[PDB]
Amino acid sequence: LPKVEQVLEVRSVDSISMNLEKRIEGWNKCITRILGIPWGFLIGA
Amino acid sequence: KEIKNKAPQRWSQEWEVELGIKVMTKVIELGGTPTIGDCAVILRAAVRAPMPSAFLNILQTTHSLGYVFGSPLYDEIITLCLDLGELDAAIAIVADLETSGIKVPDETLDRVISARQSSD
Amino acid sequence: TCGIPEIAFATFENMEYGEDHMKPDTETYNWVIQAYTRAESYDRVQDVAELLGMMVEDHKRVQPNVRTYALLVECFTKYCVVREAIRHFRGLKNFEGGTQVLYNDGKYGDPLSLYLRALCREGRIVELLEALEAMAKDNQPIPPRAMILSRKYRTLVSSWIEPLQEEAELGYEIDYIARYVAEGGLTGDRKRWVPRRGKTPLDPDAEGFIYSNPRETSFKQRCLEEWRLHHRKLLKTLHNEGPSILGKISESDYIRLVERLRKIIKELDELISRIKLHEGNTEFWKRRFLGEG
Amino acid sequence: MIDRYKHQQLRIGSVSPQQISAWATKILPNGEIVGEVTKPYTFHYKTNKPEKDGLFCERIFGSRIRRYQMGYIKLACPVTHVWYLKRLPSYIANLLDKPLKELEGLVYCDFSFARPITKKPTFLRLRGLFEYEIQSWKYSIPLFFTTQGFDTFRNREISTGAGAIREQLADLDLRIIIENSLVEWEELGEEGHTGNEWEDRKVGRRKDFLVRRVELAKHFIRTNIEPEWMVLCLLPVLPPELRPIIQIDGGKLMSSDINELYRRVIYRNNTLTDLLTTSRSTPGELVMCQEKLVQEAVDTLLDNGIRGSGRSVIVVGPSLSLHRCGLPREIAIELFQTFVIRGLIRQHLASNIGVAKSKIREKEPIVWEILQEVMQGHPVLLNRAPTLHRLGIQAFQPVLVEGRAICLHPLVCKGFNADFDGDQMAVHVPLSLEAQVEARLLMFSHMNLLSPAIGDPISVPTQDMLIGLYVLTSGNHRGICVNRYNPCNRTKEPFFSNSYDAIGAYRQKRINLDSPLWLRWRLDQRVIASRETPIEVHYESLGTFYEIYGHYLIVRSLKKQILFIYIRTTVGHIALYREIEEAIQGFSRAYS
Ligand SMILES: [Mg+2]
C-alpha cells in the first residue's frame, strides 16, 4: 500500500526510479540542443 | 519564409525622414489631414540630420495642404541650406516661397540674396 | 451574438466529435472565433489559440477565408499581440476586399483603426506602410478614429519619431486659448483629463483595446531591439548547434566572436555574415528528425 | 443528434459594501429602516423572550423566514479580511508593491504612510514609507490653519488604520501597474549579475512575485470586482437557526462560541462609536487601541467562521430465492405505515388518520393483509453500513417473515462480505415512480453477477455448496482400496437404461452413492474422456467389436456403426447432470 501511495502521488520523479529521472534529464537537454524549433519541444513532451 | 530569415536593417535618421515623407503623402492621398505639429516634427527631424534633398517637398506639401508655419523657422532652414553649401536647394526654396506668397523677413531675404550673388 | 462563448463552444464540440455528415467547416470555426472574440466576460485569449490549433485540418478541406483572417487579426490586435496580427493581415491582404471586411462598418471597436493604432504605438512602421498602401488599393477611407493626444500633435505620423510626448516647434507660440475653444469649451462638454477612481480607460485611444494600449516606443528603440534580438538568436544558434564552421581559425575567431556578440547585445565581419540560421523551414527539421541531418 | 444543451453557471465573488444592504434591510409599516443590531444582550433574563435589537431578536431576524433572514452591523472603523492578509499568499501586499512588515504595522501597530491616496494635490513632502514614531509638529501644523481646517485635508497625507489601506486600494490605476511591472520584469534578469544561491534564488522569488502581481492585476480589469472590497466596512450576520438555538425557557441561552464572539464584537463596536460620538478631542492612543481591539476581534470571528431504516442482524435463509428477502413484521410495518394508511383510507374501514392509526396499532388481521397486498410487488433497497465494495447496495423484494432478523440469500450474503458478528442492515424504500423503475430494472441481483474488476463471477457457491458438489463429483476408490486381491483371478450393477431408474434405485437404498454402475447413453457422441487409447478391443469373428475404455464402452458393428454406448459412473455425476439439464429445460419452458 505505501508503494502504491508513493507511486501514485509522486513526491519526486527519481523516487519511483532513478532511470526515469536520468532519462528525462537527458531528453530535455538533448532536445533543447537539437530541434530548437517548437517541434523539438513537442517531440520531447 | 522569405522575410522571416532575412537580417534587419539598421537605424538612420535619413531612413526615418524618407519613410515619413511617403507615409504622410500616402495618408494625405488616402483622405487624412495631419495637423501642423505632425509636419513640424518631421521638419525638425529633417533639419536635425543634414538632408536638403526633401526640404522643398516637405514644405510644398504643407503649404499646399493649407497650413503655414511660423516666420522664425523659415530662416534657420534657408541658412542651413547655405551652411552646408547647398545653394540650388536654397534657390528652389525661395522660388516656392515666392510662388506660395509667404513673407520672408527682409534681413534673411537680403542675406540669401547676397549668398546667391556670391554663388552667381 | 448572445455574449456567452460557452453556448457556441458546446455546439462546436457536438459537431467536431460527432458523425461525418455533421463535421464543421470554415463557417463554423468563424462563428466560434467570433463568439470567443467579442465576449465581455473574461480573458478568452487562450481559447482562440486552442481553436486555431484545432482548425489545422488540411485534409478535411478546412481552409481559411477572408472572414477567418479578419477575425484573427481583430482578436490578436485587441489583446496586444501584434507579431501574429501582421502575419494574418498579410494573408487578409492577399485576398481582394479584405480591408473592407476587417472594417466591419465600424460597428465593433473599428478593428482596422485599432490595428493601425497598434502598429503606430509599437513603432513597427514598416508594417504600417504596407498596411496603409493596402488601403487605397481597395478603396477604403480612413476611419474617423484619428485620435489626437492632449498635446495636439499625435497622429499616425508622429509616434515613431524620436521625441515622444513633446510638442513640435511651429514658430509662433501655442495658442492654448484657441485650441481650448476649437476642441471644446463654452458649450456642451469637454474631455477633461482628470483622474478618477472607476476602472474606466482614461486615454481615448484605449477605448477598443481590452487591457490597455501597447507600450509607446519610437522606431529607433524597436530597430535596436530587433537588431539585438537577431544577434541574440544568432549567438544562441552558434552556441549549441554552431560548434563547427567552415573557417579553420576557430582558436582566434571564436574568442573574438563571442566577446563581440556579447558586447553588441549589451574585417572579420563576413564570419558572421555566412552564418545561416535555419528557422521556419520544416524540411530541415524533418531531415534532422529522420536522422540525416 | 443534438444534445439537450443544459447550461448552469455557479458564480462566486466578493460582496460590495452596497450589495450587503440588499440582504438584511427590509421594509416596515411605519417606514423606519431596520436591520441593525444595537443591543448586546439577545434574550431577557428570567423571561425567555428575545430582547429587541439583539442577536436572536425579532422583525430583523424572525418559521423558515427566520432561518432565511439575516442581519447587518455597521462598523465605525474599517477592518480587513482574515485570509486576505495574514496568510502566506498576500494579495493586498502583491497589489501594493510593499512588503508585509509595514502593512502589518499599519493594521496592527501605529505606523504612518506619506500619502496613501494620490488623487488631489498635496503639499506635505514627507517621502516616508513607514514611520516608527511621530516626530512631526502635529500640534503646530493642525493649530496653524484653522480648527476643522486640518481635518478636511489630513486624510490625504496622514492616514492610519485599515481606512488607509482601503483608500490606497481604491485609487489604484490597474492599467499602469501592469506596464511598470512588465518593464521591471524586462529590465530585471537582463543585466547578468551572477553570484551565490542567495542571489539567483532572490531574483527568482522577485520575478515570481512580479508575475503573480501581473496575473492578479489583469483579472481586476475585466471581472467587475473592485479591489477595495477586501476590507469589511460592514459585517454580515449569520441567521439565527443556522446558529445553534433550540429554545429559550426560563432565561436559558443556547449561545455558542460564534454567538459570544458576535456579542463581543458588537459590544466593542458600540463602545467605539459611543467614544467617537462623545468627544473628538480624546487621546489617540485609547481610540486606536480600541479600534485594534475590535479589528482583532472581527478577525478572530471571521477565522472561526472559516474553520467552522432499521438496523437489524442478518441471517441466512436457504429457502429464499435470489431476488426475495425476508423482512421482519415490525420493520415492514414501520416502513410501509404510509402505504397501509393510504390503503385503509382509500377503500373502506377507515374514515380518518386517527382511526387508521388506532386500527394499525390494534394488530388486526386486516392491516396485515393490506400490508402484504402493498408489499407484494414493491421493491426495497438493502445496504450494509460499511460500503466497501461496489455491490454493497442491492435491491430485493420484501417478504413478510416473523422474527427480529432480516433473512437474505446465502449467495448474496457471501457476496456482501458477511461476518460472524451481527452485521447491521439499513432498509430503504423508494417512493417515486422513477426510483421504482430504476430499482426494478437496474439494481436487482440477477442483473449484476460479474465483478467490474476483470469480469469474474461474484456470486459463486459458498463453502457448504462446494463441499456438497465435491462429495457428489468425487467418486470413490478405484484400485487397491476397493478390492483386496488382484481381480485377475475372478458383476457390477445392472445396466440402467435411464438415469431416472438409477436415482430411483438409490432412493430405494439398493445401491450406494459410491457404487459404480453402467448407464446406457443414447449415442449423444459427446463422449467426455482423455487422450487415452482403449485398454482392450474384443474384435469377434462376426464383425462386432467392443472398445473397452477406462470410463465407457462403445459397441461398434462391422459397417462403422455405433450400436450401443455405456458409461461407467456413479449416481452423483448423473444427478448433477440431470438437475442442470432439467433446470435449463424448465427455464426454457416457463419462458413460454
Ligand atoms: Mg461483521
Give the pairing type, strands D314-316 and D71-80: unpaired
* Dihedral angle over CA of C237, C240, C246, C252, nearest 10: 100
Q: Crossing angle of helices D197-220/D176-187, nearest 10°?
A: 160
CA distance A23 to A13: 11
**Half-sphere exposure of D335 toward its Cβ, with a 13 Å CA cutoff?**
27
Q: Crossing angle of helices C6-16/C26-37, nearest 10°?
A: 160
Contact D262, D55 (CB under 8 A): yes
Contact C100, C138 (CB under 8 A): yes
CB-CB under 8 Å, D178 with C211: yes
Using an 8 Å CB-CB cutoff, list chain C residues near D183.
Answer: 215
* Interval between CA D418 and ligand 1 midpoint (Å): 7
Which of D171, D175, D190 has the CB atom closest to C211's CB atom?
D175
Decide: C and D in contact? Rule: 3+ Cβ pairs under 8 Å.
yes
Contact D428, D309 (CB under 8 A): yes
Chain center to CA of C14: 33
- For every residue of C240-252, DSSP letters joined together read HS-S--S-S-HHH
CB-CB under 8 Å, C146 with B11: no
Decide: D and A in contact? Rule: 3+ Cβ pairs under 8 Å.
no
CB-CB under 8 Å, C240 with A32: yes
CB-CB under 8 Å, A33 with C240: yes
Which of C135, C153, C279 has the CB atom closest to B4's CB atom?
C279
Using an 8 Å CB-CB cutoff, list chain C residues near B38.
Answer: 153, 155, 157-158, 168
CB-CB under 8 Å, A32 with C241: no
CB-CB under 8 Å, C14 with D171: no
Q: Output the CA angle D449-D450-D452, nearest 5 degrees.
A: 135
CA distance B46 to B24: 14
Give the pairing type, strands D380-384 and D314-316: unpaired
CB within 8 A of B59, min separation 6: which ones?
Answer: B43, B69, B93, B96
* Residue whose cell numbers read 519619431: C161
Q: Cell for D276?
A: 467617537
Contact D517, D496 (CB under 8 A): yes
Q: Cell for C38?
A: 467579442
Cβ atoms < 10 Å from Cβ of A45: 8
Contact D416, D392 (CB under 8 A): yes
Which residues of chain C have a Cβ shorter than 8 Å from any chain D Cβ?
A: 6-7, 10-11, 14, 18, 41-43, 195, 197, 199, 201-202, 206, 210-212, 215, 266
Q: Is D225 helix (H, G, I), strand (E, B) or coil?
A: coil
* Interval between CA D264 and ligand 1 midpoint (Å): 50
Using an 8 Å CB-CB cutoff, list chain B residues near C126.
Answer: 19
Annotated binding site of D for Mg(2+): 419, 421, 423
CB-CB under 8 Å, C43 with D218: yes
User: Resolution of the experimental model in angstroms, please?
Assistant: 3.0
Which residues of chain C have a Cβ shorter than 8 Å from any chain B Cβ?
A: 125-126, 128-129, 132-133, 135-136, 141-142, 146, 148, 151-153, 155-158, 160-163, 167-172, 219-220, 223-224, 226-227, 230, 277, 279-281
Contact C170, C151 (CB under 8 A): no
Which of D1, D175, D220 has the CB atom closest to C212's CB atom?
D175
CA distance C94 to C188: 45
User: CA of D37 to nearest chain C CA: how many angstroms apart?
Assistant: 32
Which of C6, C10, C43 has the CB atom closest to D222's CB atom?
C43
CB within 8 A of D373, min separation 6: which ones?
Answer: D343
Closest C-alpha to C79, from C25, C125, C36, C143: C36
Using an 8 Å CB-CB cutoff, list chain A residues near C290.
Answer: none
Chain C interface mutation, best of A28, A34, A42, highest count of C Cβ atoms under 10 Å: A34
CB-CB under 8 Å, C156 with B23: yes
CB within 8 A of D585, min separation 6: which ones?
Answer: none
Q: Cell for B19?
A: 519613410
The distance in angstroms from the start CA to the end CA of chain D is: 38
Cβ atoms < 10 Å from Cβ of D192: 7
**Half-sphere exposure of D152 toward its Cβ, with a 13 Å CA cutoff?**
5
Give the pairing type, strands D406-408 and D545-548: unpaired
Number of cross-chain residue pairs from A and C with Cβ atoms under 8 Å apart = 20
Q: Cell for A19?
A: 532511470
CB-CB under 8 Å, C171 with B22: no
Chains that touch C (3 or more CB pairs under 8 A): A, B, D
Nearest-by-CA chain C residue for D218 = C211
DSSP D36: B
